[PDB]
Each structure stands twice: as C-alpha cells, then as structure tokens.
Amino acid sequence: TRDQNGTWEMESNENFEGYMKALDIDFATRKIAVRLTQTKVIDQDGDNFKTKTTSTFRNYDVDFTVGVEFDEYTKSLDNRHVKALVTWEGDVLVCVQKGEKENRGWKQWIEGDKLYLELTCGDQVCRQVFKKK
Ligand SMILES: CC1=C(/C=C/C(C)=C/C=C/C(C)=C/CO)C(C)(C)CCC1
Numbered sequence: 720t721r722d723q724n725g726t727w728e729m730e731s732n733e734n735f736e737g738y739m740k741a742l743d744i745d746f747a748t749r750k751i752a753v754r755l756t757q758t759k760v761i762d763q764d765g766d767n768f769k770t771k772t773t774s775t776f777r778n779y780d781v782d783f784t785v786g787v788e789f790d791e792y793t794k795s796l797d798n799r800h801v802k803a804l805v806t807w808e809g810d811v812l813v814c815v816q817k818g819e820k821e822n823r824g825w826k827q828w829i830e831g832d833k834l835y836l837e838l839t840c841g842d843q844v845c846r847q848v849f850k851k852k
Pocket residue numbers: 739752757770772773774776777778779781795796825827836838
C-alpha cells in the first residue's frame with residue numbers, strides 16, 4: 720500500500736552507472752558513486768514527503784507534496800532545474816521530471832518490507848531495492 724515511511728538500506732543497485740551516464744554526470748563522480756551503498760530516509764505525512772538519500776560520498780534531499788508541481792534543483796546530481804510532479808498510480812509513487820532530458824523521472828513503491836526505486840532518463844533505467852531497517 721501507500722505508506723513509504725522509514726529508514727531503508729540498499730540491498731541491490733542495478734545500472735546506476737547507465738542512469739548517471741544518461742544524466743551526464745562526470746566521470747570521476749560516476750565512478751565513485753557507482754561503488755556506494757545508499758540509505759534512504761522517508762518521512763511521509765499524508766501527502767507531504769521529506770526524503771533524504773544518503774551515501775558516504777554525497778547526500779540528496781528532496782521534499783514534496785503529492786500532486787503539487789515543484790521546481791527541483793538537482794544539485795548533488797547533474798545540477799539541473801526540472802519541473803517535478805509526484806503522483807500516485809495505484810500504490811506506485813510516480814515522478815515526472817520535465818526539463819532538458821527526455822523520459823526523466825522515477826517510480827517508487829513498497830512490496831512487503833522492501834522499497835523499490837526505478838530511476839529513468841533517456842533510454843536508461845536504474846533499478847534499486849532497499850530493505851526496511
Ligand atoms: C547520482 C548520485 C546520487 C544518487 C541520488 C539519487 C538517485 C536520489 C533519488 C531521490 C529520490 C528518488 C527520492 C524519492 O523519495 C547520490 C547523491 C547518492 C551520490 C552522488 C550522485
């Protein structure tokens with residue numbers, strides 16, 4: 720169902736490098752970042768989300784309200800401005816990031832005690848799995 724609250728520790732990371740390549744993240748950053756285990760912290764209250772994604776290298780925080788379009792500045796990533804919109808499709812949390820890159824966004828959902836994240840940009844898809852701590 721729709722409750723994504725918790726501290727979530729990465730179990731699997733697939734094609735993170737291709738996704739970052741599609742974002743044109745620089746070589747040295749990609750090569751370090753592809754090594755790392757991530758932790759995701761999600762505070763969800765009704766439609767209000769506060770998320771922190773953490774690694775030993777760099778963190779990325781984004782806050783949003785479901786159904787409310789917002790300007791996302793991807794400073795720790797590819798450093799672009801996108802117009803993001805997060806909505807529910809069934810119990811899948813879907814984000815479209817409109818801007819320079821085509822097909823850019825992500826989908827996040829819970830199955831049991833695991834959180835699944837699919838990150839897309841261009842023709843690249845990264846798939847992550849996290850275990851609830
Ligand atoms: C590329 C890249 C990273 C990946 C960040 C990502 C992919 C965060 C996704 C946020 C989402 C989907 C929030 C949903 O609640 C980190 C900062 C780890 C290391 C440096 C470069």
